[PDB]
Amino acid sequence: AVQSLIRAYQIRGHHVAQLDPLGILDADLDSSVPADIISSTDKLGFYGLDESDLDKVFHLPTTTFIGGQESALPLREIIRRLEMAYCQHIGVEFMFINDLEQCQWIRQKFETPGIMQFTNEEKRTLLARLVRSTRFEEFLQRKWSSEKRFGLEGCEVLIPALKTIIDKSSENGVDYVIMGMPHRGRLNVLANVIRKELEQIFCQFDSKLEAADEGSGDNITLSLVANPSHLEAADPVVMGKTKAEQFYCGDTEGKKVMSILLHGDAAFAGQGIVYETFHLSDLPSYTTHGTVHVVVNNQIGFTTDPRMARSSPYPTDVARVVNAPIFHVNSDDPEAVMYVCKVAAEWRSTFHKDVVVDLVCYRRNGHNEMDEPMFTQPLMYKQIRKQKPVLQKYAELLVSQGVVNQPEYEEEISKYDKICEEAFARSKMSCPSTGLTEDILTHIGNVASSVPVENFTIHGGLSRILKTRGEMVKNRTVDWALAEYMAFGSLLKEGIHIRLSGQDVERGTFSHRHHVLHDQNVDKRTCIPMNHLWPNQAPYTVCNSSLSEYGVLGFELGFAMASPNALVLWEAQFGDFHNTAQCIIDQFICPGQAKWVRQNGIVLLLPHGMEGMGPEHSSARPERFLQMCNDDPDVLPDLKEANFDINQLYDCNWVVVNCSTPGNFFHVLRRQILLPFRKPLIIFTPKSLLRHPEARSSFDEMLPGTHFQRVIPEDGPAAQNPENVKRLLFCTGKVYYDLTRERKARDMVGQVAITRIEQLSPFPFDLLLKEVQKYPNAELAWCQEEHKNQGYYDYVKPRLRTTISRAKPVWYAGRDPAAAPATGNKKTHLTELQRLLDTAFDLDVFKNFS
Amino acid sequence: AVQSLIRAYQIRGHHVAQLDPLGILDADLDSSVPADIISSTDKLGFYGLDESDLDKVFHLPTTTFIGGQESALPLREIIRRLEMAYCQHIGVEFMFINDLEQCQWIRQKFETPGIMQFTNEEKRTLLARLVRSTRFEEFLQRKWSSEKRFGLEGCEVLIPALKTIIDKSSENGVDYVIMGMPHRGRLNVLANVIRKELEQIFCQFDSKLEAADEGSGDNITLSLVANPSHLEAADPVVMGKTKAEQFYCGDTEGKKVMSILLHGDAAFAGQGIVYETFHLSDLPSYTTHGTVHVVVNNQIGFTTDPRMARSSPYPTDVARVVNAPIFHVNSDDPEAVMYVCKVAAEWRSTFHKDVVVDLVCYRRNGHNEMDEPMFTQPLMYKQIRKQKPVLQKYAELLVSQGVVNQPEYEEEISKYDKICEEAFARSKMSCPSTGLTEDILTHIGNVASSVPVENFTIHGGLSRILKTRGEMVKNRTVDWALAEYMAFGSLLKEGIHIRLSGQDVERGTFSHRHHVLHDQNVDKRTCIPMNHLWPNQAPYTVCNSSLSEYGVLGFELGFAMASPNALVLWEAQFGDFHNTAQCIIDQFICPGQAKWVRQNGIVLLLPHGMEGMGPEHSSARPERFLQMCNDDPDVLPDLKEANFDINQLYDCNWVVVNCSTPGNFFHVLRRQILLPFRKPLIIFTPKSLLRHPEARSSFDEMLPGTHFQRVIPEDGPAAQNPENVKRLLFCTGKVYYDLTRERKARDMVGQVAITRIEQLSPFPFDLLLKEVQKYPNAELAWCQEEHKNQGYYDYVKPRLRTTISRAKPVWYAGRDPAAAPATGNKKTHLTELQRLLDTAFDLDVFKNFS
Numbered sequence A, B: 001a002v003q004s005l006i007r008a009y010q011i012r013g014h015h016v017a018q019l020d021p022l023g024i025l026d027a028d029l030d031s032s033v034p035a036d037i038i039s040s041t042d043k044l045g046f047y048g049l050d051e052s053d054l055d056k057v058f059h060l061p062t063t064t065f066i067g068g069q070e071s072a073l074p075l076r077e078i079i080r081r082l083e084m085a086y087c088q089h090i091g092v093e094f095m096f097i098n099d100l101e102q103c104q105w106i107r108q109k110f111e112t113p114g115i116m117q118f119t120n121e122e123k124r125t126l127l128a129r130l131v132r133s134t135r136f137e138e139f140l141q142r143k144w145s146s147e148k149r150f151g152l153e154g155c156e157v158l159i160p161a162l163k164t165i166i167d168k169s170s171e172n173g174v175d176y177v178i179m180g181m182p183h184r185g186r187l188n189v190l191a192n193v194i195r196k197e198l199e200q201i202f203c204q205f206d207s208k209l210e211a212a213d214e215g216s217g218d219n220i221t222l223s224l225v226a227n228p229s230h231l232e233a234a235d236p237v238v239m240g241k242t243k244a245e246q247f248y249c250g251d252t253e254g255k256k257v258m259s260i261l262l263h264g265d266a267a268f269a270g271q272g273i274v275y276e277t278f279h280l281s282d283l284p285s286y287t288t289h290g291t292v293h294v295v296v297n298n299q300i301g302f303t304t305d306p307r308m309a310r311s312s313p314y315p316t317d318v319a320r321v322v323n324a325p326i327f328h329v330n331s332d333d334p335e336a337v338m339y340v341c342k343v344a345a346e347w348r349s350t351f352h353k354d355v356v357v358d359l360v361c362y363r364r365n366g367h368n369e370m371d372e373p374m375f376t377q378p379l380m381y382k383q384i385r386k387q388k389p390v391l392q393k394y395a396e397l398l399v400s401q402g403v404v405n406q407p408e409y410e411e412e413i414s415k416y417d418k419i420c421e422e423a424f425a426r427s428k429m430s431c432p433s434t435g436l437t438e439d440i441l442t443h444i445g446n447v448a449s450s451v452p453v454e455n456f457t458i459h460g461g462l463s464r465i466l467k468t469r470g471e472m473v474k475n476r477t478v479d480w481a482l483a484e485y486m487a488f489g490s491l492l493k494e495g496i497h498i499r500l501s502g503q504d505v506e507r508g509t510f511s512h513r514h515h516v517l518h519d520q521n522v523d524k525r526t527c528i529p530m531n532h533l534w535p536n537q538a539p540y541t542v543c544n545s546s547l548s549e550y551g552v553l554g555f556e557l558g559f560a561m562a563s564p565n566a567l568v569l570w571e572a573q574f575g576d577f578h579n580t581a582q583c584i585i586d587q588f589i590c591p592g593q594a595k596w597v598r599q600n601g602i603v604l605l606l607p608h609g610m611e612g613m614g615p616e617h618s619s620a621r622p623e624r625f626l627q628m629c630n631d632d633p634d635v636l637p638d639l640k641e642a643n644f645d646i647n648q649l650y651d652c653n654w655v656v657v658n659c660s661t662p663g664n665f666f667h668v669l670r671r672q673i674l675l676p677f678r679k680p681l682i683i684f685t686p687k688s689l690l691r692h693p694e695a696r697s698s699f700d701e702m703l704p705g706t707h708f709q710r711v712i713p714e715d716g717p718a719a720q721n722p723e724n725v726k727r728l729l730f731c732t733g734k735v736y737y738d739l740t741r742e743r744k745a746r747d748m749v750g751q752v753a754i755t756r757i758e759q760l761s762p763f764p765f766d767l768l769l770k771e772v773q774k775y776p777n778a779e780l781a782w783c784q785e786e787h788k789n790q791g792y793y794d795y796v797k798p799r800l801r802t803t804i805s806r807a808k809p810v811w812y813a814g815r816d817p818a819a820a821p822a823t824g825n826k827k828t829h830l831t832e833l834q835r836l837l838d839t840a841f842d843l844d845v846f847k848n849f850s
């Protein structure tokens, strides 16, 4: 009889809660009272009860904790205690959880008498924190009025909440905390929670204010990651950083690393990023064993109201798809906020699960500190202007109780004002060798072309693949997969950790690498032969990710930030789906060092090639990456510097390469780690050269004394007699092979020279100038399997014309411009390719003008 | 006693349900049986019951329909009926709904007896549909084996499900259906549901198979929209199209327009787009009154296991945030699927709410028809190759029952086969005047600068704004807001519908337009002044959207497809966040007429300008838009055609404009509608020119006989004496004004000519040539307030050098290249701007070389 009523309250208590600070605007966007909650004695008929039952004593179930060292209670006691627990300033949304132990723990924490009481020292400390926050806010206001400082006015209880979280984490065992937070309230945290020299904060208020830099305090260590103004675009980055620190510190269960994130109410229910980030929480490869989310519900986004912003009651619904409990609290009552923070910290330290806490508050001023909010919401601010601040009412309550005397509070205010005034007055290298000796290469080749496990049986096709691998190894020949194994194993020997993530990377999207072997008979038997290469070596991890291209890339980037001695690779199924995560490339990878001055070295792998498989299963948009480079096309650098290659690579944002041969792909990954500094790397991997019969290289290019070749000159009869060569030809990728075959078909050998360019960013001016001067009489041309308005023409042409003294035109030999990456008609592809190949190996296509 | 048990089943039935077609892999990803379900007589102790209670008769509650014509069933009946209803081929997830009427309606359907029974005619029709689907699949397989087509084998009950849905919609009143669905099963729907000439389908299989294209059938009308391979990227487009059709057809409640969407299991739980699309559902401005989502749960994504893909149990947990009920069904049983589809159609026609139906099935072959799935999942396919197809077992069951005889079934197979081979054998203009007479302009100015409602009081600042508006109107002067009002009112007079949607558009992000007036004291009293202009006129709508930049743009794009007689505008808060919806610009607006034939005229508004607000609140990336143009920079078109302005505009893919004066903003908006055809328009609106004192124009540029000016020539003393002008200068946007000020500070009037370029795409190659020939001895230069690697230099320079016969170099006068859109230091901005003005206005920064 009573069990149904208690369940009904545990379901619908948060809907009738006075979480509203102003008293006017509602929190759940509905003022109706559902019939489940007994708002009056007339509603007992819904459960079949009546006014005669309000005095009969009822026995509590095993899922109720209001008894407090008491078994049965009069129904009036149950109703009063249940209203106090669920329908006052705290509303708990947790019964969507199917686990029983977590539900019982939450009930015990939030449904027992005499557990929320504080001590006088805690009240004094809370008063001190509230005074610090409020006086800092008014000092910023009165010393800087005509500014846009995004104030935290009408919600100062945030700072004590964060301090309570950090203190509970410290006493629970945590020794490292990583925090992410939007702009609203940044300076308060930077001055009170992550304590910093106030003179430095005042100095940085006037200059460098726009940039949200990184703040570190080192005795729990606190780090505040830099975040951009894009909303909710830094959660996966924080999760990746937390995972990397957990892995490096040896914490398998993450008992000493913690993650805290702050969100606004409007963005937590309007961005699809939160969905993707929440789905990464439980995946075995992306699980940081717990994050604490704090969402500030000021009940407004700029000038947009809550009812025209979302299709859900609360802005906290995304967290319920993963069974993460949610706590909504009224910011007016500070003790409730403190207890909720303590409960959330205990929950994270116990169950290693995400938890979200919602701070219901209001906004005292406009969106900016000089905006006019009466234009759009008159009633809201008319009601706002008739309410006391939280500090004033808290101080009055404490004075009435007798905890603090008025002179002490006044002295505290005066001394903190003097501290602020005093602070304000005071305020104003060579390229390594990447080769390997033959025994290491032979050992890796033999281990990779077999199965280490004794009774491990594989498929027949896989057996044929391994036999072909062994035949290649014994003949001193390497293909794409073998080159990948050799590079990764060589790095693993030196102690460098390697992580490879993305979609379908364990088997390969084209089924070419087979890095993970599966047993046909046993259900979960799995063998990774690479861990068996050497007795002592760095770990190796390969992971399959979800379909989100946005959260996984951010996670990988955050992981790459922790340590330089690590090789993190992200693989996309096709080069056309990277645009789903453009924001991550736009704000985090592109200007990571220009603003924020921190180093990263993530490797991005993008398959790219035109083979008729579709208008959008073809091409990786390299012209989008090539335009985001801090290089001036009109200036030719000094080509006679001490090194140039390493100096040029030092002054750039990232590197862009398009590898066609396995040897260069082997050397690039080694050069990524062996260098002193780190920079992001973008690689355009082929799609049809994996099985190509002549896409192979010998071991002689993998031996000691060999460096990565940024530009591969032409080898053949053309080089033997260079004065007779016409039509000097440049290419980048598979287009080389398609040319060479035709050069054999048309008997153009000795009349056309074809050269590749592996590295596009930065531009190799020196090597290109050296090889262009090799052929005095040859018409420069650029080949391309993409359209004119796509690919590398608009990037390469200015740089090629800069390399020479604009002494020669750079012609084009490729497809015509189009509004799509490729064509959807199979018949026209062959005609286009035949026309593309017509101009090459058929001279006088451009000499016809004269 | 029993109410708790029934409640527990209604919560946890779908977890123990036998939905798995394979007794092997699970769908909720957990094999454990929760203690709520009574799997054996020993578990009755959880509810306090025991084996002695299995025979006692228990009265049913008012929220349980098991019984039919019974009040009390003996407990052995309740348990059996509940297991049959919730734990046998059907799992219903709906109890998260808080509404009681919807819950009772759902319960009645699946929880009442003798409701799922069919008739012999229905069974015959189902057999016919299954035969058609299966024989078409095997015919495609045997006639085309070496193909990468995506096949529907494994789930062959999809076609009858869709046909049942459409039939129920037709009988419920729907007369128009819009459908979107991914590649898996496209041909089966195109050949069976949306019936099409099979010869045409066979012809398009060989050629033009790559592109999606649009399939129509007109007696319910069926439209299948084109969608790319990007997963979940076409739902908002479908919803926008549905909304537009509902609005033109006059269905306020949408009783005659319906929307159907199909999803895969892996993409419905891995993409954040679904989150935004689901929040767009209930929003009053974006409400399509229901949408029947169908998710096919084949339990595998390419080669990725469902456990390493998501954190939620089922891949349909994003629909529990909007209280949308979910039905999971086993595709083996066809009657259950048919009944579920009927129930979903009735639910949509009744409650006007979204509903999701999950068909649990398996995949018979690899991802493509020649993929090898034994490499990664051995046990799954080892079990798959030992199961009968659904058609075979259904035919055997019907033969045993006696509905159909074997000769009839064989004859049906033979006749459909013969139809298949028979089909296979058979298979093989001037620019308008946009001016207005003075009385219309005066009327719109008077109405817009005053309040229409008589008892309506506004703020004092708003009163001052309206007084300034009236002063401008009486003095024959127009600003940005007045120009917008005049354009919108002029279009509304002609009967053209106008819709403006996006973030903070009702008031304006800079509080300059005030299109919506709010009453200070009376609650919710709105007053749109432009809805009161003329006695008969088209409706006007302004909406505030959510923070999702991706879903709203897709919704607007879908809306601008239904009819040409409409002006749909999308406004962004800043030009930097548009990249969040890059995919929509990548696969839908860019190649929307090059790939599919449909035409679109959406207007995109992007604030753009460098003012020192930050590196992320400055610049709108115009160089990203300018590179996606199917224009060859190396060819100069024929400048002596009849038009060369309407012809040039006819070939392009969209238009890009940067408007500074309000008159051009008026004229371009009028020209967008008055043109015979439709093309997308991108406008770079200013931010600091809204309040600029000289950013104004007279009425003489809005009178009859005035056309939009693509290029504004240089007016002033320089034009009077053009032979004495040096440093011919090109600009685009606010920079002009700054330049003029500096010129006035340096007395360089008559020595520098500054010209704007309003239209960049199509490129004006005629007016620019004329004005370049106007000044013979003048060094061309380009002035931007953005970095050299960004902005318009890389686009404009090749086109400017093409316009002339490469006879004069195009210099640069702007900021130096950088890895970020702007700087984060306030001090360096002033130095950068001063250096920019210095190098712009001094006469030897380039001539010093000689």
Ligand SMILES: Cc1ncc(C[n+]2csc(CCOP(=O)(O)OP(=O)(O)O)c2C)c(N)n1
Pocket: A184, A229, A230, A231, A263, A264, A265, A266, A267, A268, A296, A298, A300, A301, A302, B503, B547, B549, B572, B573, B574, B577, B580
């Ligand atoms: C992706 C994106 N992020 C940000 C903006 C601009 N912007 C900055 S703050 C803000 C309001 C966010 O609302 P809410 O989370 O409620 O913030 P609060 O009231 O706490 O400032 C918006 C829209 C934008 N247009 N697009």
Ligand SMILES: Cc1ncc(C[n+]2csc(CCOP(=O)(O)OP(=O)(O)O)c2C)c(N)n1
Pocket: A503, A547, A549, A573, A574, A577, A580, B184, B229, B230, B231, B263, B264, B265, B266, B267, B268, B298, B300, B301, B302, B367
């Ligand atoms: C955004 C994106 N879209 C598409 C792909 C490539 N792709 C095409 S179909 C497919 C499988 C989708 O899985 P599921 O939804 O289970 O569909 P099914 O295999 O049953 O068709 C993938 C990953 C990708 N990597 N990223």
Ligand SMILES: [Ca+2]
Pocket: A015, A016, A028, A030, A031, A032, A033
């Ligand atoms: Ca309520």
Ligand SMILES: [Ca+2]
Pocket: B015, B016, B028, B030, B031, B032, B033
């Ligand atoms: Ca289960």
Ligand SMILES: [Mg+2]
Pocket: A264, A265, A266, A296, A297, A298, A299, A300, A301, A302
């Ligand atoms: Mg807010």
Ligand SMILES: [Mg+2]
Pocket: B264, B265, B266, B297, B298, B299, B300, B301, B302
């Ligand atoms: Mg699937």
